[PDB]
Every structure is written in C-alpha cells, then in structure tokens.
C-alpha cells in the first residue's frame, strides 16, 4: 500500500451548502491504509468517531467530527467518548489524526444541568496534554469553542490543515453580523462581506493557524510524510506527580 | 517641555479609572465591585504589584482603532500580591472596558501572568467577570482562548489554580474555570452556560432565564461544575482568603504547618 | 484531422456524461473552444471541467436546468455560443428547442427539422419508409380508435401483435399480443399507457416478428443530401427495451445483404433530404427480411462499436456536415477494421429484475486502459455520484479484434480487470452475456435474457475445477493475510518469535458445503489440498492493490478482495461474480459447532401506494417481513417525505418502486397478493 496514494474520491466528499451532512467515515477509509479502521463505540454517542487503523504500516489513532448524527456537534457522551480514547493514544505513543467538522457545543437544559462544562473541558484536557504527534485537517465548518476544542495549532499542535470549504470562524457568521453590525441595522451588504471575508480560512491562513490549504486528494501523502518527521517528536513540560483532569 | 510626562500621567488617571466613571457607578449599582477594588480586598493592603497597564489592544477592524475605542489595559487588571505573607498571582477581569469581552491583549496579559506563575511556582487565582468573546478582534480572541487553556493544561498539578466567578461568563470562557482545580460563584450576580437563553429558545424553544440556565444554586445543586458560592462579593472575597490559607504554594513545597492549640 | 479546416471556433455541446467528454475530445481535436452546459449540482463533474469555460443552467432536476430553456439562452448570450448538439436524446425530439436554436446564432447539428417530426409519428414512418422502397414490418397502416378495431386488425395482421404508440426513445411503448381477448384488453391498457405517458394514442398495430435480430445501419449524411452508410451494428442482446451488448458487425449478417441494407437505408436518408448521422434498425429474422423499425435522428448510444471497425471519427465528420461541407469519404473509404464488441457497465443490480435501479458514490473507479485493444468511454470520476434526475449510466467499454474469439476475449479481460466500488454494478451480467456459449456461437434473439434466465440472473456458476481454483485461491490469500500480519518491526526490548506452523488446515465455508482444505507455503507459492486435488497457486501477494492476479496450475486468474473481517467472511470477485466465503481455522470451526444460531425472520411484505411522488430509496425486497408501522420504502410528495405505514400481512411477488421513479398514488409500488 503505497504511501503517497492518491484520494481523488475525497475531492467532492464536502458538499457546498452549509446544511448537507456526509459520511466521516468514508473519509477516514479513503486515507487510511487498505481501508481498515477498527472501530471504538461505534453505536454510542455517534457524533464521534474514534479508532484504530494504520498509516504506512504504523499504527495511528483517528479522531472526527460526524456530521451526520446531530449535525457533528460536541455534547457530553462525545466528549468522555474521544476522551478518554485520545489519553489511552497518549499513554502508549500512538500518534492522533483529527478531521474537525464540528460546528458547535450542542445547546440545551439537559446539556447543562448535566455538566457539558466538564465534558467539554475533559476533551480540551485530553487534546492538550497529548505529547504524541497530532496531525489534524479541517474539512468544514469550524467555530465557536469546539474549534480549538478540537486539537487546534494553539494546543501545541504539530500540523494543521484545511481543505478548501474550511469556515474556521469566531461564531455563527450571522451571529457575528448581527452582534458587530447591531448599530448598523444594514446587514443587506455587510452580511455579504463578512461572509467573504471570514467564511474562508484566509484569516487563520494569514495568521499562520493551519499550515497550509491542501487539497483533498493529497490528504494521505502529505499525512503519511507528516508522520514520519515528526515520530522523533520530544518535549518536555514541568514536573509533577500528575495532573487533575475534570474527572 | 516634553508632551510624555502628562501624557503618563493621564494615561495612568485614566487606566485607573476603568473605562468610565458613570460604568462604574452603573455596576456599583447591580450590587458589584470593579475589579480593582476586588484586587485591594483579596490582597494584603500595599502589596499589589500591577503589570502591563498600558498595554492596549492592537485590533484595527469595525473601527476599533479610533481614540474613543482605546483603552489602557483593556478590560483586565493584573498583577501579583501577597495573602498573609504568602506570594499569590492574580487578574481580575473587568467588564466598564467593552463588557470585558476577551481580545488579543487581554489574553496576552493573562498568558503572561500565568507564565510568571508557573516560572516562580506560585498559584493564580482568577476572578472571571466577562460577557464573553470580543467579535471586533476576530481570530485573535479564539487564539487567546486556546493560549489560555493550554497554560491551564500545562500548570494543572504543578501550581494550584482558583477561579472565582464574579459575574456573567459564556462562551468559550467557561472552559478556564473548568480546568482550574476548584471554581467559586457568587449567588444571584454570576452566570455560567455555554449558550444563552435566546439561543435555547433558537435551538430546542424552552423557556429557561439566566439564572435557570446557568446561576450559582445551579451550578452548585445539580451540575457539579461549581463548588462553593456566597453571599456577595465581599463575603466571597473573605471566604476565598481564608480557603488560601490552606494551599500550598506549589506541588514541590509540602503542605502548610501552621500554630495549633 | 486537418486543423486548417475552420468549421466553428465556439461550440455549446447540450448534455451531459460520456457523451459530454467525448464531443468535448472530438471539438479539442479541432481545437475548437468547448461551452459544456452543466447543473449547479453537476459544476463539478469531467466535461465542466475540462470544457474551455461553463455556464451554470440551473438546479439539480434536468426539468428546471436542462429543460428550462431561459437558463439555456442565458448561457448562449453569455458565451455567444454558435453550435448546439442535443446528444443521446435529450432535447433531439423537442421540435420548440430547435426552432429557437434557429431563432439564435446556434445551429442544430442535425438533420432536417421536419425529418424528426416524420420520425416522431410512427405511422408516417412507416408511410414514408414505404414510400422510401424500404421494407416494412407487416401490419396496418392507420391508427386504430376502438377495441372492434384492434382486433380486426389483429385479424388481418395475425395473433402476434405490436400495438406501438408513436415516438418513444430507444423504443418505448411496445407491446406483446397472442389473442383476441388479448388483443382488445391490450389495445385498452395501451391506450391507458400511451394517454399517461406521451397521450398520441397514435398506436400503429402491426405483426409481431419472433426470433429476430435487431440491427442497426447507421447513415452519413452530408448537408448536400449524399448519404454514406457505414457497416452495421447487431443489438440483439436486450432486457427491459434497452441495450446492453453491442456488436457492430454482426455475425448473422454478411456481405451482401449488408450492402442491400446500406443501400436502402442511403435511399431512404436521400428520400427525405438527410443532413446528419441517423441510424435505422431492422429486425432481421431467419430469412433476412429486415422490416423497417423506427428511425432514430439522434446519433446513437453506441455509436462507438462500429467507429473502431470503420475507422472514422463519427463526431468529426458531423461536424464537418454542420459545417456543410460533402462527405469527402466514399463507400469504398468504409472498410471494416476487425471485430468490435461494445458493453455499457451500469449503476444497476443485476441480481433482480435484469438489473435495478441503485444510487450512491463512486469511492475507487478504476479502468483497464493498460490492456490491450480496450477503449473506455466515460464521464464519470472517482468521487461522482449518481443522480436521480438523470440516468444512470456508469461507462461504455469497446473491445476491437482480428476475429471475433479476440474481441471477446479482450472484453472478458478488460471486464474482470474493471474496478467498481461504492455502487452496484452490472458486471456479472456482461460478462456472463460475453462467455455464454449461445453468445459465443451467435445464435442469439431478442429474448435471449429471457430465455437463457427463466427465474432470472443467478450469477456464474463455477463448475468443479472452477470451485477448486476459487477454494485455494481464497486459502491462499487468507494464509497470506496471516503470514503479513506475523511481520513486525525490531523491538529491540523484546524479539518476536516467529511461529513455524507449517501446514495450514482450514475450513472453507462456500454457499453449504464446507470443504477442510490443506494450504502449505513455500516462498511466493501456495501448494492447496482441497478434498485431495493438489493446486499451486503462485502470484506477487500484494494485499493492497483492488486487482489480484494469481497463476492456478499455470492458468492466469484474475480476482478481486472486496471486503474482509476478523471473523474469517471473505468477498471474493472471481470471474464477475461475487462469493462469500468463510474461512475458519480446523480448531476454531470445530469449537463454532457449540455456538447457538441466531435466526433472523422477515417474509410476506404488501403494501400499495397511498402517496405520490418521487421514490427517494427502495427498503423492501421480495420476501420481507412487515407490521403495523413497517415502511415499504420512502415517497416525498410535495416536499414531505411520510413513513408509509403497511398495516396487513401479505405477500410479494414483485417491486415496482426504483429509486428515482416518479410513481404515482395508488400505482402500486410493490405488487402483492
């Protein structure tokens, strides 16, 4: 199974419009290696996708937003889930792969009274304090907190990507309009510009936040050569007995 | 004649007054302190040591670089101190200074505070008062966000960390309060939730307030996100001393001996 | 190809697909820029993308983009389009588009205006085929109103009876009567499906012919009214009205009467003035009297097959008479080059009703351009996925040969070695067509699917040798699998110690039987006891790439792995079909016998249809079990898609709901008892 194949059949895995949803699943098969990938809790809390597979012959641990079940958004059964899989990855110096397609915190009073605040911070916890490589890739919308709840370049990531229908964005870009432009009450062309300027990852692009814009059919080469310079990764962090995780 | 002198000079007088001294009186007036004054309670009397009042947000969209627009410190007071002898860091968010919404500056500040913290191996305590993320900034604030929970990731179990919430906190905000070891409120002013109410209504049409939603008798009965909450401010401020006095400084020193009887 | 020739500089090629791409290589031969009309959803398929610009038409549905012609004269003003090419169907008959056509600067490349409207009405087809010295199929000319009617007709004509509406693409609208009850409850539900479908009720009766060859001539007509026709094209392979083997020339046909069919068919163009390519079909029986059958002024779908035998670029000499200029090739200019064989792989089920209509996405897709003598015409890519608003149609494969024996051969080849994932295909049934001894030999009719399949397509059956071969190649693979899943890295801490089993016993678990089989190794080669025939499989064993090729006993098999688990299940493509098999180790097979059956029943579904509507997936088959609340399949009507509760017990006995067909309430989406 060579390592720079080629994924053409993720080149149109997105679809245009903001409300359509697609198989994660069928992208984590396109890349990995001969399409194998063990799966972990596959009918519990199936906004997430974690499991095993293999990328040139050296065993990885993939991570992903599914848009399918509940539009892919973050709740607490999710978050315990990739959790505590991404500490038992960590623990044995298995690398972690992300496809982010997350658009938000799920919202709600069962949410709440429930503790989605611990949850929600157990996944922030467990992403960073991976001192494992972490590779991740955007392939959609991308705000709010989830978006550097998922393994952003601001946790000590390694390499991050986008593919070119990333919308990495503060919040709901009508949200934004609307709390920005309030006194402006014109929102007619506002809202046209700031959806073309911030609907694109052109600002975290220019900020240096993802390493590049890839395009889909490259995903698994440049993965499998990302994976090879970085499996010499070292880093040191302070001393101490452990730590104390939202347990 | 050199324009630098009284230009320090108002800079200070006007970084020490927040952003307005008609704001302060209107959060006087919901039964809330500023955050300097928080500073002066929770510390030993003359031994605050404040850093980086100058330091300005460096955003230029939506019109936020004109002079109306600027202000020193911007919405966050920080520093260090002493509690009964004992060295302690801490910032204080303000919410005069654009509803101490958190931007690049702010997060630089608080970044820079918990890496001294960190170096010299003593705790931060935080006391969170702060609509939630500046939208004017843009990416900036999402990044001082991540910046900030990493530094909380990186010092959890080396320095302990204590959180007060002393007003309305949503967004990603209430993730730092979450990742600090213990996290206190403030009955019947501060607020805790992901979402706000109107976004419940958008989303699932429950009619839940802000206190329903995210108050202190939530947070503490039914959630377990909170540990503690008291009656006011002051009452908080006191209580959060006392509780101090028990900590040790860092995970190296060994847990403190007082004088018994 | 002579690039001096300036015909048109900016071409508006009307479709989408194959088709598509190939006009668009045809025009880049020229050198000519390209406008490849496409829907918002189809932005991102071949032809839009490799065209020199595009305009987008409108929405996914073909009725609101390709047939909303505002779109479409948009496009033209944006791209001041010059030429139009309607493609296989499409809007060819639509008699509106091109009197607009005319009313812009776009020309219709095709024939005659009043040509397709004589083609359009089958009476006046056969009216003016007559009139053309073109023998007729037998029957009456007129079109009959009344029941008394039909059967006096059918008197004169006989009992077997083609009551036929007029028009129809590809033949629509046929029909099968044997008796006068028969002829008169036929004419009644004919005249029933003619008013739902096209509502002519122009039904031509005429006799039926039994056993007969449909064939193809395909004429060249220059805009001077000269008419070259060029060898022929054999379709007598068909289920459900529509082709899927093509042989261009045709193994009944010989010489001689194939220069009387082109010469009857080049008086039949000249009697109408033809100025385009056009195809007529006969229905050639024992005797060769081929009898005219309908007259198609669109190129035809298969045009390919026999552009390899005559050499000549279809598409460019059309181009050419749209510029018109003569037919610079002659009659003698046509020579047969070889054989050609020609097979359409689908996005259909073969496995029921001759193949079904199925939706999904295209995940690998590959082709066997590297054979030999093997040509793929496609306008589809990895990652395309198959719409309902339009055909599904995968790909058109053409072998050419010196005789016969090769271009079947190199289709048999080129079908196994054919890469197709994420959708159902029709493979098994092609190939299954191209190794059938009554294909190989030639004696073929039109109703050889329905003959040679009386319950329907089953798959190959692998005969004792065939089963041998398959059994050890699976052992061999499974073995393999292990044998690579024994290979770490160097630990350095601590050495893996490599077991040293040397003969391994399985159980294979194929269809019932179960076969023990004994699969030792030795280097790249496999030695496969199977029941004590003793195999040797040899072959690279690379477990990555879709195509496997092994040598069992010297002969060359070519296989694919589609699917495999750690519970030993194997899908194995061996020869088209595809079997599942389980293999289990002799300690693991002997233990499974303690393990209780989980049973699973689901039988005896009914339901009709109460709603409306487009079928948006199928979720029943023949044979499943259905409740209070159980859903035959999903139907939106009016933008709301109601779960369709069954509510009884009864039983299937066919489906008529495909995913992408418009029926309607009370069409009876599933029939039942």
Redesign the interface.
């Given at each position: 199974d060579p390592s720079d194949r080629l994924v053409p059949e993720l080149d149109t895995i997105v679809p245009l419009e903001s409300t359509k949803a697609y198989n994660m699943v069928d992208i984590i098969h396109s890349v990995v290696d001969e399409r194998e990938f063990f799966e972990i809790m596959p009918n519990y809390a199936k906004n997430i996708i974690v499991g095993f597979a293999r990328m040139n012959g050296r065993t990885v641990g993939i991570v992903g937003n599914q848009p399918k079940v509940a539009s892919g958004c973050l709740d607490i059964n999710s978050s315990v889930k990739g959790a505590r899989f991404v500490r038992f990855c960590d623990a044995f110096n298995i690398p972690l792969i992300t496809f982010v397609d997350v658009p938000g915190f799920l919202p709600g009073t069962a949410q709440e009274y429930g503790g989605i605040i611990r949850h929600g911070a157990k996944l922030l916890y467990a992403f960073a304090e991976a001192t494992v490589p972490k590779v991740t890739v955007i392939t959609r919308k991308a705000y709010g907190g989830a978006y550097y709840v998922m393994s952003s370049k601001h946790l000590c990531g390694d390499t991050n990507y986008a593919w070119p229908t990333a919308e990495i964005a503060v919040m709901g870009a009508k949200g934004a309009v609307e709390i920005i432009f309030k006194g402006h009450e014109n929102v007619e062309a506002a809202q046209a510009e700031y959806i073309e300027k911030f609907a694109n990852p052109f600002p975290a692009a220019v900020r240096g936040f993802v390493d590049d814009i890839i395009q889909p059919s490259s995903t698994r080469a440049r993965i499998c050569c990302d994976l090879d310079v970085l499996a010499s990764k070292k880093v040191q962090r302070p001393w101490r007995k452990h730590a104390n995780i939202p347990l | 004649a050199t324009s630098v002198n009284e230009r320090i000079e108002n800079k200070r007088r006007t970084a020490l007054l927040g952003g307005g001294q008609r704001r302060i009186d209107a959060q006087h007036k919901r039964g809330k302190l500023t955050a300097r004054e928080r500073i002066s309670l929770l510390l030993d009397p003359g031994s605050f040591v404040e850093s980086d009042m100058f330091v300005e947000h460096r955003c230029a969209d939506?019109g936020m670089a004109a002079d109306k627009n600027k202000f020193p410190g911007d919405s966050v007071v920080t520093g260090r101190g002493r509690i009964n002898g004992r060295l302690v860091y801490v910032f204080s968010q303000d919410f005069t200074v654009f509803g101490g919404s958190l931007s690049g500056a702010h997060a630089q500040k608080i970044c820079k505070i918990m890496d001294q913290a960190?170096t010299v191996g003593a705790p931060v305590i935080g006391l969170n008062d702060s609509g939630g993320?500046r939208?004017?900034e843009?990416?900036?604030?999402?990044?001082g966000?991540?910046?900030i929970?990493?530094r909380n990731?990186?010092?959890?179990?080396?320095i302990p960390q204590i959180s007060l919430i002393m007003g309305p906190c949503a967004?990603?905000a209430?993730?730092s309060?979450?990742?600090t070891?213990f996290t206190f409120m403030v009955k019947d002013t501060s607020y805790?939730?992901?979402?706000g109410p109107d976004?419940?209504k958008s989303?699932?049409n429950?009619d839940?307030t802000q206190e329903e939603?995210?108050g202190a008798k939530?947070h503490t009965t039914?959630?377990?996100?909170a540990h503690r909450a008291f009656e006011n401010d002051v009452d908080a401020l006191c209580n959060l001393r006392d509780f101090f006095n028990y900590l040790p400084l860092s995970?190296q020193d060994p847990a403190p001996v007082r004088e018994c009887h | 190809y002579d690039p001096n020739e300036k015909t048109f500089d900016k071409i508006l090629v009307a479709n989408r697909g194959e088709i598509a791409c190939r006009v668009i290589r045809t025009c880049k031969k020229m050198g000519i820029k390209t406008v490849a009309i496409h829907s918002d959803v189809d932005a991102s398929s071949v032809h839009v993308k490799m065209a020199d610009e595009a305009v987008c038409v409108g929405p996914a549905p073909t009725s609101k983009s390709y047939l909303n012609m505002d779109a479409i004269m948009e496009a033209i003003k944006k791209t001041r389009a010059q030429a139009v090419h309607p493609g296989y169907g499409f809007l060819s008959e639509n008699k509106e588009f091109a009197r607009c056509l005319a009313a812009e600067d776009v020309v219709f490349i095709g024939p005659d205006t009043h040509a397709i409207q004589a083609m359009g009405d089958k009476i006046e087809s056969k009216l003016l085929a007559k009139k053309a010295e073109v023998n007729t199929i037998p029957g009456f000319d007129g079109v009959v109103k009344d029941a008394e009617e039909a059967v006096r007709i059918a008197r004169e004509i006989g009992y077997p009876v083609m009551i036929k509406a007029s028009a129809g693409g590809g033949g629509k609208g046929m029909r099968i009567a044997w008796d006068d009850e028969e002829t008169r409850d036929g004419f009644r539900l004919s005249s029933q499906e003619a008013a739902s479908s096209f509502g002519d009720d122009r039904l031509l009766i005429e006799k039926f012919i039994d056993n007969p060859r449909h064939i193809e001539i395909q004429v060249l007509g220059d805009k001077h009214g000269n008419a070259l026709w060029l060898n022929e094209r054999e379709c007598s392979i068909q289920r459900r009205n529509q082709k899927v083997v093509e042989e261009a020339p045709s193994i009944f046909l010989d010489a001689e009467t194939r220069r009387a069919m082109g010469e009857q068919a080049v008086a039949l163009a000249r009697a109408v003035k033809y100025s385009s390519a056009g195809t007529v079909e006969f229905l050639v029986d024992s005797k060769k009297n081929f009898y005219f059958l309908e007259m198609n002024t669109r190129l035809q779908v298969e045009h390919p097959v026999t552009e390899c035998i005559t050499g000549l670029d279809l598409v460019q000499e059309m181009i050419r008479v749209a510029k018109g200029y003569p037919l610079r090739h002659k009659q003698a200019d046509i020579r047969i080059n070889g054989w050609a064989v020609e097979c359409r792989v689908y996005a259909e089920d073969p496995y029921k009703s001759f193949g079904l209509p199925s939706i999904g996405r295209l995940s690998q897709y590959q082709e066997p351009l590297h054979l030999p003598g093997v040509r793929v015409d496609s306008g589809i890519q990895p990652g395309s996925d198959i719409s309902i608003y339009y055909d599904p149609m995968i790909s058109k494969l053409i072998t050419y040969g010196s005789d016969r024996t090769e271009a079947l051969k190199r289709m048999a080849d080129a079908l196994d070695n054919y890469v197709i994932r994420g959708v159902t295909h029709n493979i098994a049934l092609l190939r299954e067509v191209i190794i059938n001894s009554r294909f190989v030999k030639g004696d073929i009719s039109t109703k050889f699917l329905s003959d040679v399949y009386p319950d329907g397509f089953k798959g190959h059956m692998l005969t004792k040798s065939e089963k041998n071969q398959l059994l050890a190649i699976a052992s061999s693979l499974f073995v393999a699998f292990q044998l690579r899943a024994q290979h770490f890295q160097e630990n350095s801490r601590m050495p893996v110690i490599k077991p040293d089993i040397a003969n391994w016993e399985l159980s294979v678990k194929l269809h019932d039987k179960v076969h023990t089989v004994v699969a030792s190794n030795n280097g790249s080669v496999f030695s496969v006891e199977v029941d004590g025939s003793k195999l040797n499989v040899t072959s690279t064993w690379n477990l990555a790439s879709p195509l496997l090729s092994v040598s069992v006993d010297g002969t060359q098999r070519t296989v694919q792995c589609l699917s495999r688990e750690a519970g030993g299940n194997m899908s194995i493509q061996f020869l088209g079909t595809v079997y599942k098999v389980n293999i289990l180790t002799r300690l693991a097979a002997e233990l499974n016998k303690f393990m209780l059956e989980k049973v699973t029943e689901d039988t005896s579904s009914v339901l009709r249809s109460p709603m409306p509507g487009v079928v948006v997936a199928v979720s029943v088959k023949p044979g499943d079990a259905v409740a209070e609340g159980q859903e035959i399949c999903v139907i939106e009507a009016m933008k709301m898609q109601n779960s369709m509760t069954a509510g009884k017990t009864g039983t299937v006995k066919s489906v008529h709901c495909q995913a992408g067909d418009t029926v309607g309430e009370g069409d009876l989406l599933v029939e039942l008892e």
């Open positions: - | 939506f960190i993320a939208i004017q843009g990416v900036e604030s999402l990044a966000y991540a910046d929970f990493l990731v990186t010092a959890s179990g080396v967004g990603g209430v993730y309060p979450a990742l070891d805790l939730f992901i979402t976004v419940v989303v699932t429950e839940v939603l995210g939530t039914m959630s377990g996100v995970s | -």
